[PDB]
Amino acid sequence: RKQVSDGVAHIHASFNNTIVTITDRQGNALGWATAGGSGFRGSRKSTPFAAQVAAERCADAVKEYGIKNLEVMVKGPGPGRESTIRALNAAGFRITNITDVTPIPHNGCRPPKKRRV
RNA sequence: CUUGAGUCUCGUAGAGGGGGGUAGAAUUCCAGGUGUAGCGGUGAAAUGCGUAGAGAUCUGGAGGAAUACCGGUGGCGAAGGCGGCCCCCUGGACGAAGACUGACGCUCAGGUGCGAAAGCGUGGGGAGCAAACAGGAUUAGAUACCCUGGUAGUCCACGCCGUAAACGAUGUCGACUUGGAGGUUGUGCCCUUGAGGCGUGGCUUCCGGAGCUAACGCGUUAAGUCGACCGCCUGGGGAGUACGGCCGCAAGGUUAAAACUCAAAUGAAUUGACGGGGGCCCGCACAAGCGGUGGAGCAUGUGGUUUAAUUCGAUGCAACGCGA
Incomplete structure (x- = not known):
């Protein structure tokens, strides 16, 4: 309660x-x-x-x-970037600033080699 | 005596490195703070990890990798290859002026030098994360494609190991031969008025005349015309195999056959076919409703069995109220 x-x-x-x-x-x-x-x-x-x-x-x-x-900062890949906004708009909240704050990797390390197809 | 080769002065483009620190744009371990009910993953599901407080956010933080932008068909180097900048000190390429060198030129069987990864022993290290290793998951089954944890060892460094599609599948050097559109670097002349033209070098890009080739394809970056020089080639498998030698302490490299067998192997390309390659169209083919078979009984035919015989043929759409 703050x-x-x-x-x-x-x-x-x-x-x-x-x-x-x-x-x-x-x-x-x-x-x-x-x-x-x-x-x-x-x-x-x-x-x-x-x-x-x-x-x-x-x-x-x-x-x-x-x-x-409140404000919303979306991050990460995957489908649903609009479903969460629709859920926030239907829950009764407001929309202040919609940003994509996904963590952008800048190739510091090496990417894995699991995908070989 | 210069026009081949080499040389001076001034510069210009350009990951040329060697040794050394610097130290980011992001990063896993080790903590403090807000604070709950789950983090992750594949098309289904789960191992593991959360109440011992995770994943979400702020503060700074042990150490190894290494460029997202630049970054690209960019650009360099004899090749294998080189990405946070600097200087220590070395390389190659190119031009305008001037010179002298008088051929000092090209190539090479021997031979030395450069050699991707990994491993060995000597002395260390342990993150990001790796063949093997331990689990979950699927399938008729999994030593794997899937999902999660990981030993000496991949890193700096001393020597061995010297291989490959080190492939422009196109040796090296030099001279002539119709052409068109680009990329990176310079300046000469032209009111440089300027981003710009006319030249003139450079090499890497795309298409094509004759010509050559079996065609595909080459074609001023030659596989078109030549000259010098080196290597290699003689049907496949056997076979980069066996023996001996050289080198490597051993894991192997090289030189390198024979017996036997096969009557072929192969390249290009024209046709059809096929594909769980793509694209473009048609059909009650689907999409929406009506009536059904399959549920009950009966008729009929067929598949099985019995029967002294249940005649034969038809037999997936092209067979079953068919021949009748």
């Missing part, structure tokens, strides 16, 4: 998972979302209707603070 009332949201999307962690502007998290525990398990996720309902998970733990406006 009532920061505003904080950015980091949306880490992968090829098979998406998690929405709402932090403040300084770096203090209030509530994070998840896709592995949205009822079903295995690999049925990574699809829009399962990613938006996963993003809706912060509508039960972040509302207790009093966030009426």
